Amino acid sequence: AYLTHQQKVLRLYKRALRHLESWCVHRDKYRYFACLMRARFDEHKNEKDMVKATQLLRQAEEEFWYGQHPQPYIFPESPGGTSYERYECYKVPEWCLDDWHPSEKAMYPDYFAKREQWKRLRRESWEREVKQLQEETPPGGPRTEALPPARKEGDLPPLWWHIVTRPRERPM
Amino acid sequence: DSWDKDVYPEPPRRTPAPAPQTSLPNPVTYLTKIFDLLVDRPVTLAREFIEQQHAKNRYYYYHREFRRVPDITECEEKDILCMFEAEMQWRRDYKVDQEIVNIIQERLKACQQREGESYRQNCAKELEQFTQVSKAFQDRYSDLGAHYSARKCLAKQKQRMLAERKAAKEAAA
Amino acid sequence: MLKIIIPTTMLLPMTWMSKHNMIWINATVHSLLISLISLSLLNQLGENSLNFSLTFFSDSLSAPLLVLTTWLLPLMLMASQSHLSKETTTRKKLYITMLILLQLFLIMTFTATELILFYILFEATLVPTLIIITRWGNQTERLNAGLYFLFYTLAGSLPLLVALVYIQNTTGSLNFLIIHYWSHPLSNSWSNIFMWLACIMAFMVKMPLYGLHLWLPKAHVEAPIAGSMVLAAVLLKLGGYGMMRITTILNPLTNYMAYPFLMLSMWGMIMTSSICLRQTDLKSLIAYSSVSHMALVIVAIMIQTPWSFMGATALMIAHGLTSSMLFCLANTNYERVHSRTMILARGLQTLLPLMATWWLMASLTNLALPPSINLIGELFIITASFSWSNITIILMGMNMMITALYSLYMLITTQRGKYTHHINNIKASFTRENALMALHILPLLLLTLNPKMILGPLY
Amino acid sequence: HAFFKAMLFMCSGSIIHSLNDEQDIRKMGGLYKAMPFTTTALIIGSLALTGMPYLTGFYSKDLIIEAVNMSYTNAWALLMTLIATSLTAAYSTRIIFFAFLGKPRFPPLVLINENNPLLINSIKRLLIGSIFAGFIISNNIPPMTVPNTTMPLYMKMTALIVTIMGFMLALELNNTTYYLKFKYPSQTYKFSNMLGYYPSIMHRLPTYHNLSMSQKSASS
Amino acid sequence: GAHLARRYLGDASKEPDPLRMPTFPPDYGFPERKEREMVATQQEMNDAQLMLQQRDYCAHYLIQLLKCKRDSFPNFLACKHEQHDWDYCEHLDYVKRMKEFERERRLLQRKKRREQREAEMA
Amino acid sequence: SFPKYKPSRLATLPATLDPAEYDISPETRKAQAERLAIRSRLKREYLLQYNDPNRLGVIEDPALIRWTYARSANIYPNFRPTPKTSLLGALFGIGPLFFWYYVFKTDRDKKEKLIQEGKLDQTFNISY
Amino acid sequence: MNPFASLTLTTLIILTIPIMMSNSNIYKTNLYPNYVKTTVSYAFTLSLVPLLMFMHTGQEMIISNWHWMTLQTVELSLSFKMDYFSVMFIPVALFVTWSIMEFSMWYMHSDPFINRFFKYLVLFLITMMILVTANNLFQLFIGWEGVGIMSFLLIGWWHGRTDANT
Amino acid sequence: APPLTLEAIKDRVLYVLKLYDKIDPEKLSVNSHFMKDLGLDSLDQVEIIMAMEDEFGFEIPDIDAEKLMCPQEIVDYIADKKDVYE
Amino acid sequence: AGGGVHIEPRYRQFPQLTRS
Amino acid sequence: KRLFIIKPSGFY
Amino acid sequence: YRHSIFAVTHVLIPVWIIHYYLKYHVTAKPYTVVERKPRIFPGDTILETGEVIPLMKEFPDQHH
Amino acid sequence: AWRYSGGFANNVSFVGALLKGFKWGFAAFVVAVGAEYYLESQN
Amino acid sequence: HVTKDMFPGPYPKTPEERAAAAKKYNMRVEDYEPYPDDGMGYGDYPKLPDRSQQERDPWYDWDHPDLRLNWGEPIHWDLDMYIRNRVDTSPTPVSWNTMCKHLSGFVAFMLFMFWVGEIYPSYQPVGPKQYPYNDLYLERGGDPTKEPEPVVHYEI
Ligand SMILES: CCCCCCCCCCCCCCCCCC(=O)O[C@@H](COC(=O)CCCCCCCCCCCCCCC)COP(=O)(O)OC[C@H](O)CO
């Protein structure tokens, strides 16, 4: 929603240091330059003129957009990294496992029995968790994509199935 | 041998006698030796068994021969009865001539590996024979069209000495 | 000859008089049996065509297409018994009646010895296909689609009717042998061009060349699965058969008048394949790919070169078997998702692993990857075209380069990638769909060992 | 090239898998003692690539550089081969410097391991192959190219001068990173590092035009 | 060597172009010059499967090298003297090459200064 | 201050250098407040049918079918012949076709010229 | 007619066996990678004998096996040409990929589709020594795309990685 | 890679905050909210999460990085992101 | 990753080696 | 440890 | 043993059928397996016809 | 600190890496020349 | 299901049906800009910013993460140019005009003096390959009947 100034500065601080890390590479340089980079940040902390603070962040990222490393450092799991959705091709949705032939299902009896409990739980919980939704939905549709928790006891938080039953990040 | 040596002239192979001097054993002799009593002999043993069985009950087959039949230059105009024999005879000779080029092409390709680095000059005879065939083949069937017929082949040919005799008249002057 | 025809038409009473639920079985039995008998016809002699009577004859060109059509006949029955299960027995019987009646006409026209006899069932194939597209088609714009497909071919076929009867009144009979033996040099008189145009445009229309092709995307997409295969795997190819047969009395007029079509076809294939690169509909993308391959044959046939005819017959069959398979791929995916947009169901390989394979050789075959019969077709045509002119390879090779991008484009968008979260009705593939898919690919590689069977009379 | 170039990959693959599938050259350092065999494997491979005498690359590259020099060729073409050979050593130092000769930079939990016989046997199998390599092939094949004999010694050393020269400054440039001075972004670095600017343009301009032509024009 | 600079940086008329020489007649400047007497006739050089670029005068010191290699097998450390003999022969062939190069080179500058000497006197 | 980054249709200006949101107004911030609301209005019911146990099918996107319609059928009914459309059609139509005709015509008009006077070599060219 | 020509060709028929065995699906679904690695090893060991025969004698082969099909004056035939450029390349190429196979099991010790992976490498391999060993331009063109399409699948081994497909 | 389990996470987690000289070891609690009691400025909070990022090797999105606020909550967000349940 | 590996990992320390 | 792996039914 | 039956059913058997195919089918057709002429050197005799072709004529005595 | 402490400290210099094994390599050298010089002398 | 009126229609001339069309694409009127009426039949489909899917924030949760798309939002008319696999639009660190300038500069710079490199080739001062038997005429495909012109090499 509102990308207020302080988050933008934190965006500037976090990403610039990562780029600065990609430059210095050596830890002592990275540590040394970070502190001075830190030092020149907090020194201008007293500005009642928020517009001036914005003006101070005009040339800020422009120098960054010049000073940006053409190949920044990203851990491979993150977007752009080498191991980005590398193991996605393995993860398969759980609902496809309902298709399994009974002989295949018989190969894993107790786990399939546990699935039945989850199937049973999600059934009545759906009506309960959906009922909580309309009774507390803000007027004029949802104003924020954040989803309210389960207010009462026993009931599960609404729309919990896909998040909870999401395939693990390392499926094999 | 199954095929004919005249159709496929094979110059005699020049195999040098093995005269090594180094005392350490030449390995390739041994690998050939073990191969002989591990692969070659069992293959030959099976081969002599199959070949004698083949000769036990021998059945024959011959090669069909088409006698000469009047072609299209003496076939009457229209008269598709005589055109049928004419066209089929010409197309049969087309097949033979295509195979004739094929035979020459193999002989030319046979020289390449056979002569090795001597290919450039050793079989210039093979080169000119193919050159003579290919040029003459061009005058016979080339550019006849996908719907080629003995009529067109005669038509294309009839242009040839038409231009040639016209050139001969000019040459005589 | 007869040993194929009566078994085909006598198959019709069987389906009508069979039991309520056995219709698919007994029809499939003898359709495959008919295929076996047709394969017995595949043999050819050296130069004289296999002639049977005044009414029917076969050559090295007709025979490969004949066995292809009979081979096709089981496949529509296999491909259709999923969206017609919930239908009254009479309509199912009527649907089967349409296919074999259609297939019966195909045997007739390919074996026809007289051009008019070739002509009469040349359009007669339209009536069963018009019913298939209109009645059992599953869409809304199928009505306009059937009209476009019907009128386009008639608009081209009727000039052939006037042209063909003119031959009869001028050169006696129109028996294919009698035309070939009594061929005369067509003059350059300004009437002979309209003579030439009429004898060619009829086969142009149902062989979609750039400009005269807008019916095909509307023909294929709204047609049902069985209609799409028959239309793309044989119907686009009656035009092909006609040109190899009818260009006997169009020379040397074909030498000079070929230019507008050759430029239209060679440029069209680049344009059409470009459309494939950005098609939103999977069935439409396959349909436009057929235009590109078919337009390649237009250059092939119209060059009139021994090599060009040979590569034509190679692409003649290989494209038909491949296009039928790709339409099966789209159909086998369609009902699961109940939509035609390509990006609707991405990452299908993680869900259906075998269909990932079946889509894979299917895309490779359409790629003209050697030694698949498609490569023998395209590569032979390129050499014939290159001899005709050196420049065309720039156009020729560019098509292969474009053909690569869009072919794997459907592969990556559908098979590879992340599976769609929302969809949950994708069930494990029925072994009918799997069996049918191998029914297509397996003879294709089986044909690779013996190109000489499908090279044609020029071979 | 089949021997030593194939090496550098699973040698690199050894560090990748062992150091938790990380492929950024800026995260290793100090691996010399951590993976002695992998480090040993890489230095032989890099030296083979540079063309150290009497081992693999010498039997081909040192002959090639001498060969093209000893011929009627394009003068501009010959010059780039020398610069490339010096640059060939240049990135070789960069790999050995950043990856091995330094201090650890990977995440704290270390899992460095190469003791698996599969990795050891595979690498060693090509190691004995790469050590001798050209000696066997050159001595075995019949003498079937024309050998040039009278080189003016000044250019016969060029096969070794340029790489040794390129070794020098690349090392000096690499440990200049150890120097505390900040590295200002040079415009040449902005060019060389971005794959030489080719992917940014040729993979965005021609693809967009042809695609836009297909939809906007053509089809529509 | 340095003749590249002498040709391009300096005048080009005083460097014998590699695509041109020899230009002056071999007898001109060489009274009673002898011919390169070849040794292995075209026959023996042929069936040795000798490649065309190696079919030179020093090829005689290449053919027996193959013979030494044939009996050397499996040992590949033999033929050292023969190979060195072959390389030394190509050295003798090679040392002649720039001898001819400067023969033309020295002659053409000599022709230049002779021309000026026999032109400025008028 | 090193020279700025000028954008392009293929390399757009990044949001980090975009002057609009750095100079927000007491109105533009209000504009980017119902953006999330309608986004939630699209996300909420989507998850509802996505997480519905009884739901066995495909959640058709009205935006998706709109895109296919606008790109497949809703072209000619919205098409109007104008000089821009007319010239582009002619330029991309007859243009390339006639261009290739001239190229192929002159090439063939040189090829047959050479062979007619015997100025070309096909000594080994037989399988045409 | 030495074993040279005979056993230089079987080397090709040696390493196509793992492909056929995989299609049976009776093939060992666990120790498959070991099966191919050992197979390539034997293919390598066989490959030296044509090599060792070469530098001794210096004979390079052209074998014209089963005649595919004849085109009038063209006789397109499956033919393998064992030049020095070939008879040397098979020994080194299998030697490298055999070592790669040994490294492959350790590195890809967790990929669930590992049997498919080793099958692809062999399929790539076959496409290779039919490219180098190509007496006719057509079967040279066979490899020139057989390897290319094989690279596409191998490069996109992680099908889900959108960049890998790109 | 052995299964990284939440007990190991918090051990590695509090290892780094104790390492941070601005947070001397004595008063580290599992749920010690940074600026509420430790006085750690939020500008350094956008700095301790990259220390976590290299500690466990993965990127923390900013949407929750500003929300990553307590050492127990540090551990909590770590576990589910790598499906750590044990 | 079962217990009993001969290359048991370490935290912020030099990893153990083997004479082999 | 050992935990269930999900996979589409390959029985058919 | 695992190497034995692997040798027989993957090396020994395939080379058997290849040799049979080569010796009696491929070589039964002309110009299918075309060798190179075994290079012969001055002074090297051949076994087919016995005679030794002449030695090289004495070199002009080049020594280093 | 851990990256600069423990066994991770005092890493070898650049040129120190390339000449790894020289001490043993030279050790194998001297015996090698001794063997061949004696063998040549016996000839 | 979508019956008829969420299907796209003709260009909205006046703001009333512009508002209706904006609701038809579940977006407000302040951000609903139709394509220009060039006559190319784009209809009432909205101008969406020419930005590839690569510019979408990956950390945001999308209903179609591979294309980074939610459900129901109006997707670009040209989605199959700007898909992640296909043409990108992400801002390069250096300007596009400079992007082309240096690249076009390099290729031309390298190509040009390659021609001048051909103008002044590099060669050692060495004569030609003295070849025996009149420059190997007979063994280079020369006609045996056509006698070669006498080519001999001397000693210097
Ligand atoms: C949708 C429009 C059609 C699509 C494209 C179809 C092909 C284009 C050309 C169509 C030609 C149709 C008529 C051709 C019939 C056979 C022609 C033939 O055999 O050749 C004759 C060609 O003669 C003709 O005049 C044929 C017709 C020429 C074209 C004029 C009429 C056809 C075009 C208009 C009607 C069709 C178009 C659609 C109208 C709604 C030879 O006779 P001749 O003139 O040489 O006779 C001897 C002497 O000279 C006097 O007769």
mmCIF file of N, CA and C in Angstrom, chain F residues 37-104:
data_model
loop_
_atom_site.group_PDB
_atom_site.id
_atom_site.type_symbol
_atom_site.label_atom_id
_atom_site.label_comp_id
_atom_site.label_asym_id
_atom_site.label_seq_id
_atom_site.Cartn_x
_atom_site.Cartn_y
_atom_site.Cartn_z
ATOM 1 N N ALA F 37 -7.441 -2.407 -2.697
ATOM 2 C CA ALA F 37 -8.802 -2.835 -2.388
ATOM 3 C C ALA F 37 -9.397 -3.653 -3.527
ATOM 4 N N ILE F 38 -9.324 -3.137 -4.756
ATOM 5 C CA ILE F 38 -9.816 -3.908 -5.893
ATOM 6 C C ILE F 38 -8.961 -5.148 -6.096
ATOM 7 N N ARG F 39 -7.658 -5.050 -5.824
ATOM 8 C CA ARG F 39 -6.797 -6.224 -5.899
ATOM 9 C C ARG F 39 -7.254 -7.293 -4.915
ATOM 10 N N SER F 40 -7.575 -6.891 -3.684
ATOM 11 C CA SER F 40 -8.164 -7.828 -2.733
ATOM 12 C C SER F 40 -9.518 -8.319 -3.221
ATOM 13 N N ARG F 41 -10.321 -7.420 -3.794
ATOM 14 C CA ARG F 41 -11.616 -7.818 -4.334
ATOM 15 C C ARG F 41 -11.464 -8.848 -5.442
ATOM 16 N N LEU F 42 -10.315 -8.862 -6.118
ATOM 17 C CA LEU F 42 -10.038 -9.902 -7.099
ATOM 18 C C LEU F 42 -9.372 -11.115 -6.465
ATOM 19 N N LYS F 43 -8.575 -10.906 -5.418
ATOM 20 C CA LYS F 43 -7.871 -12.016 -4.786
ATOM 21 C C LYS F 43 -8.779 -12.808 -3.854
ATOM 22 N N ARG F 44 -9.654 -12.122 -3.116
ATOM 23 C CA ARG F 44 -10.426 -12.777 -2.063
ATOM 24 C C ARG F 44 -11.306 -13.887 -2.623
ATOM 25 N N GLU F 45 -12.234 -13.536 -3.514
ATOM 26 C CA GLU F 45 -13.129 -14.542 -4.074
ATOM 27 C C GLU F 45 -12.368 -15.579 -4.888
ATOM 28 N N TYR F 46 -11.211 -15.209 -5.443
ATOM 29 C CA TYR F 46 -10.397 -16.186 -6.157
ATOM 30 C C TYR F 46 -9.966 -17.310 -5.228
ATOM 31 N N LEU F 47 -9.396 -16.955 -4.074
ATOM 32 C CA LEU F 47 -9.027 -17.970 -3.095
ATOM 33 C C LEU F 47 -10.253 -18.723 -2.601
ATOM 34 N N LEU F 48 -11.393 -18.038 -2.500
ATOM 35 C CA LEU F 48 -12.619 -18.696 -2.060
ATOM 36 C C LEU F 48 -12.970 -19.863 -2.974
ATOM 37 N N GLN F 49 -13.000 -19.621 -4.284
ATOM 38 C CA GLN F 49 -13.213 -20.720 -5.216
ATOM 39 C C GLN F 49 -11.978 -21.600 -5.351
ATOM 40 N N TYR F 50 -10.789 -21.052 -5.095
ATOM 41 C CA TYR F 50 -9.579 -21.867 -5.121
ATOM 42 C C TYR F 50 -9.544 -22.838 -3.948
ATOM 43 N N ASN F 51 -9.945 -22.381 -2.764
ATOM 44 C CA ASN F 51 -9.915 -23.191 -1.555
ATOM 45 C C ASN F 51 -11.234 -23.898 -1.281
ATOM 46 N N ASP F 52 -12.184 -23.830 -2.201
ATOM 47 C CA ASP F 52 -13.478 -24.464 -1.988
ATOM 48 C C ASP F 52 -13.346 -25.976 -2.105
ATOM 49 N N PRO F 53 -13.656 -26.742 -1.056
ATOM 50 C CA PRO F 53 -13.561 -28.208 -1.170
ATOM 51 C C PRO F 53 -14.477 -28.788 -2.231
ATOM 52 N N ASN F 54 -15.671 -28.221 -2.394
ATOM 53 C CA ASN F 54 -16.606 -28.746 -3.381
ATOM 54 C C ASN F 54 -16.173 -28.406 -4.799
ATOM 55 N N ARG F 55 -15.357 -27.367 -4.962
ATOM 56 C CA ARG F 55 -14.936 -26.925 -6.284
ATOM 57 C C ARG F 55 -14.080 -27.978 -6.973
ATOM 58 N N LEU F 56 -14.587 -28.529 -8.075
ATOM 59 C CA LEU F 56 -13.851 -29.473 -8.913
ATOM 60 C C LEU F 56 -13.958 -28.922 -10.330
ATOM 61 N N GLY F 57 -12.948 -28.165 -10.744
ATOM 62 C CA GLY F 57 -12.992 -27.539 -12.055
ATOM 63 C C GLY F 57 -11.884 -26.522 -12.217
ATOM 64 N N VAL F 58 -12.104 -25.593 -13.142
ATOM 65 C CA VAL F 58 -11.130 -24.565 -13.483
ATOM 66 C C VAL F 58 -11.761 -23.205 -13.219
ATOM 67 N N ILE F 59 -11.033 -22.344 -12.509
ATOM 68 C CA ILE F 59 -11.493 -20.989 -12.219
ATOM 69 C C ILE F 59 -11.200 -20.140 -13.452
ATOM 70 N N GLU F 60 -12.191 -19.996 -14.327
ATOM 71 C CA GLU F 60 -11.998 -19.227 -15.548
ATOM 72 C C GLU F 60 -11.806 -17.754 -15.216
ATOM 73 N N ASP F 61 -10.771 -17.154 -15.795
ATOM 74 C CA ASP F 61 -10.497 -15.742 -15.581
ATOM 75 C C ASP F 61 -11.249 -14.920 -16.615
ATOM 76 N N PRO F 62 -12.182 -14.057 -16.210
ATOM 77 C CA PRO F 62 -12.844 -13.192 -17.196
ATOM 78 C C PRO F 62 -11.870 -12.312 -17.951
ATOM 79 N N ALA F 63 -10.756 -11.928 -17.326
ATOM 80 C CA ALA F 63 -9.725 -11.196 -18.048
ATOM 81 C C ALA F 63 -9.095 -12.062 -19.130
ATOM 82 N N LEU F 64 -8.893 -13.349 -18.841
ATOM 83 C CA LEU F 64 -8.254 -14.235 -19.809
ATOM 84 C C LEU F 64 -9.104 -14.382 -21.065
ATOM 85 N N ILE F 65 -10.383 -14.729 -20.898
ATOM 86 C CA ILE F 65 -11.245 -14.909 -22.061
ATOM 87 C C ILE F 65 -11.435 -13.589 -22.792
ATOM 88 N N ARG F 66 -11.407 -12.473 -22.063
ATOM 89 C CA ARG F 66 -11.441 -11.167 -22.709
ATOM 90 C C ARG F 66 -10.243 -10.991 -23.630
ATOM 91 N N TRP F 67 -9.060 -11.388 -23.158
ATOM 92 C CA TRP F 67 -7.853 -11.248 -23.963
ATOM 93 C C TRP F 67 -7.930 -12.089 -25.227
ATOM 94 N N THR F 68 -8.368 -13.344 -25.101
ATOM 95 C CA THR F 68 -8.491 -14.197 -26.278
ATOM 96 C C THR F 68 -9.505 -13.629 -27.260
ATOM 97 N N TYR F 69 -10.639 -13.140 -26.755
ATOM 98 C CA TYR F 69 -11.642 -12.545 -27.632
ATOM 99 C C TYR F 69 -11.086 -11.316 -28.338
ATOM 100 N N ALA F 70 -10.456 -10.414 -27.583
ATOM 101 C CA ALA F 70 -9.941 -9.189 -28.184
ATOM 102 C C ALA F 70 -8.851 -9.477 -29.204
ATOM 103 N N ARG F 71 -8.135 -10.586 -29.050
ATOM 104 C CA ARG F 71 -7.039 -10.920 -29.947
ATOM 105 C C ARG F 71 -7.424 -11.902 -31.044
ATOM 106 N N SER F 72 -8.626 -12.474 -31.002
ATOM 107 C CA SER F 72 -9.050 -13.440 -32.007
ATOM 108 C C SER F 72 -10.221 -12.939 -32.840
ATOM 109 N N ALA F 73 -11.326 -12.566 -32.204
ATOM 110 C CA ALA F 73 -12.536 -12.178 -32.918
ATOM 111 C C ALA F 73 -12.772 -10.679 -32.949
ATOM 112 N N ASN F 74 -12.580 -9.987 -31.826
ATOM 113 C CA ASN F 74 -12.891 -8.562 -31.732
ATOM 114 C C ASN F 74 -11.798 -7.719 -32.391
ATOM 115 N N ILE F 75 -11.591 -7.970 -33.681
ATOM 116 C CA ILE F 75 -10.651 -7.184 -34.470
ATOM 117 C C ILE F 75 -11.382 -6.597 -35.668
ATOM 118 N N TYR F 76 -11.907 -7.469 -36.528
ATOM 119 C CA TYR F 76 -12.645 -6.995 -37.696
ATOM 120 C C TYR F 76 -13.874 -6.175 -37.328
ATOM 121 N N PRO F 77 -14.723 -6.582 -36.376
ATOM 122 C CA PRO F 77 -15.837 -5.701 -35.995
ATOM 123 C C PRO F 77 -15.378 -4.340 -35.508
ATOM 124 N N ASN F 78 -14.204 -4.257 -34.892
ATOM 125 C CA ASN F 78 -13.630 -2.980 -34.502
ATOM 126 C C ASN F 78 -12.663 -2.425 -35.537
ATOM 127 N N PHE F 79 -12.449 -3.129 -36.644
ATOM 128 C CA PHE F 79 -11.571 -2.634 -37.693
ATOM 129 C C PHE F 79 -12.274 -1.568 -38.518
ATOM 130 N N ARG F 80 -11.527 -0.537 -38.888
ATOM 131 C CA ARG F 80 -12.027 0.509 -39.765
ATOM 132 C C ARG F 80 -10.963 0.833 -40.805
ATOM 133 N N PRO F 81 -11.281 0.733 -42.094
ATOM 134 C CA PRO F 81 -10.272 1.017 -43.121
ATOM 135 C C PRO F 81 -9.870 2.482 -43.139
ATOM 136 N N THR F 82 -8.619 2.750 -42.802
ATOM 137 C CA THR F 82 -8.059 4.088 -42.731
ATOM 138 C C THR F 82 -6.722 4.086 -43.452
ATOM 139 N N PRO F 83 -6.226 5.260 -43.861
ATOM 140 C CA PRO F 83 -4.924 5.299 -44.547
ATOM 141 C C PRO F 83 -3.802 4.611 -43.787
ATOM 142 N N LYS F 84 -3.785 4.707 -42.457
ATOM 143 C CA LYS F 84 -2.790 3.972 -41.684
ATOM 144 C C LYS F 84 -2.959 2.470 -41.869
ATOM 145 N N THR F 85 -4.178 1.967 -41.672
ATOM 146 C CA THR F 85 -4.430 0.546 -41.883
ATOM 147 C C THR F 85 -4.251 0.165 -43.346
ATOM 148 N N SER F 86 -4.701 1.027 -44.261
ATOM 149 C CA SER F 86 -4.620 0.711 -45.682
ATOM 150 C C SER F 86 -3.173 0.628 -46.149
ATOM 151 N N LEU F 87 -2.372 1.647 -45.836
ATOM 152 C CA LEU F 87 -0.989 1.667 -46.300
ATOM 153 C C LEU F 87 -0.183 0.537 -45.673
ATOM 154 N N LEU F 88 -0.370 0.295 -44.373
ATOM 155 C CA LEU F 88 0.341 -0.799 -43.719
ATOM 156 C C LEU F 88 -0.029 -2.141 -44.334
ATOM 157 N N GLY F 89 -1.309 -2.335 -44.656
ATOM 158 C CA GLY F 89 -1.707 -3.555 -45.336
ATOM 159 C C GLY F 89 -1.039 -3.707 -46.689
ATOM 160 N N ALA F 90 -1.026 -2.634 -47.482
ATOM 161 C CA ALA F 90 -0.353 -2.682 -48.774
ATOM 162 C C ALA F 90 1.151 -2.856 -48.609
ATOM 163 N N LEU F 91 1.751 -2.138 -47.656
ATOM 164 C CA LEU F 91 3.194 -2.219 -47.466
ATOM 165 C C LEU F 91 3.620 -3.620 -47.044
ATOM 166 N N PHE F 92 2.897 -4.225 -46.107
ATOM 167 C CA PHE F 92 3.206 -5.570 -45.644
ATOM 168 C C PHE F 92 2.566 -6.651 -46.504
ATOM 169 N N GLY F 93 1.794 -6.269 -47.514
ATOM 170 C CA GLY F 93 1.119 -7.223 -48.368
ATOM 171 C C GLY F 93 1.821 -7.410 -49.695
ATOM 172 N N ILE F 94 1.341 -6.702 -50.719
ATOM 173 C CA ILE F 94 1.917 -6.807 -52.056
ATOM 174 C C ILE F 94 3.398 -6.450 -52.041
ATOM 175 N N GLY F 95 3.807 -5.566 -51.132
ATOM 176 C CA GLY F 95 5.170 -5.093 -51.058
ATOM 177 C C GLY F 95 6.216 -6.190 -51.077
ATOM 178 N N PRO F 96 6.277 -6.995 -50.014
ATOM 179 C CA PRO F 96 7.251 -8.097 -49.999
ATOM 180 C C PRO F 96 7.052 -9.088 -51.127
ATOM 181 N N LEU F 97 5.805 -9.345 -51.525
ATOM 182 C CA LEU F 97 5.550 -10.312 -52.587
ATOM 183 C C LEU F 97 6.169 -9.856 -53.901
ATOM 184 N N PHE F 98 5.877 -8.623 -54.315
ATOM 185 C CA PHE F 98 6.461 -8.107 -55.546
ATOM 186 C C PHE F 98 7.968 -7.947 -55.421
ATOM 187 N N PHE F 99 8.453 -7.580 -54.233
ATOM 188 C CA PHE F 99 9.892 -7.463 -54.026
ATOM 189 C C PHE F 99 10.587 -8.790 -54.290
ATOM 190 N N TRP F 100 10.066 -9.872 -53.711
ATOM 191 C CA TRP F 100 10.650 -11.182 -53.966
ATOM 192 C C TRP F 100 10.493 -11.581 -55.424
ATOM 193 N N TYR F 101 9.380 -11.200 -56.054
ATOM 194 C CA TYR F 101 9.201 -11.502 -57.468
ATOM 195 C C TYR F 101 10.317 -10.888 -58.297
ATOM 196 N N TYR F 102 10.624 -9.614 -58.054
ATOM 197 C CA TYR F 102 11.693 -8.966 -58.801
ATOM 198 C C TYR F 102 13.030 -9.648 -58.544
ATOM 199 N N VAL F 103 13.301 -10.006 -57.288
ATOM 200 C CA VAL F 103 14.569 -10.649 -56.954
ATOM 201 C C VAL F 103 14.683 -11.998 -57.651
ATOM 202 N N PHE F 104 13.638 -12.820 -57.550
ATOM 203 C CA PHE F 104 13.680 -14.133 -58.185
ATOM 204 C C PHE F 104 13.643 -14.017 -59.701
#
